């Protein structure tokens, strides 16, 4: 049990690092997604804005 525990605890803590690494990567991907969404938004809106202003001519 000490060995199985060391493995369960080691695997748990390691896997917990995989949890925090995947989680961190998810947050970073979300910050990137957000930034991407923000740029998308900003561009579509900048164009739609400018286009509305410039529909005419």
């Amino acid at each position: 049990l000490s060995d199985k525990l060391k493995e369960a605890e080691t695997r748990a803590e390691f896997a917990e690092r995989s949890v925090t690494k995947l989680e961190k990567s998810i947050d970073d991907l979300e910050d990137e997604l957000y930034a991407q969404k923000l740029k998308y938004k900003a561009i579509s809106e900048e164009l739609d804005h400018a286009l509305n202003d410039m529909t005419s001519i």
Binding site: L51, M54, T55, S56
Partner: peptide, 29 residues
């Protein structure tokens, strides 16, 4: 953009039309 292309032409037309009016009117006046 259709709005820009057309309305730019409309402003060009205000010039072209105003100019034709200016020229004809001035030719007589």
């Amino acid at each position: 953009m259709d709005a820009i292309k057309k309305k730019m032409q409309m402003l060009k037309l205000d010039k072209e039309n105003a100019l034709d009016r200016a020229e004809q009117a001035e030719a007589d006046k």
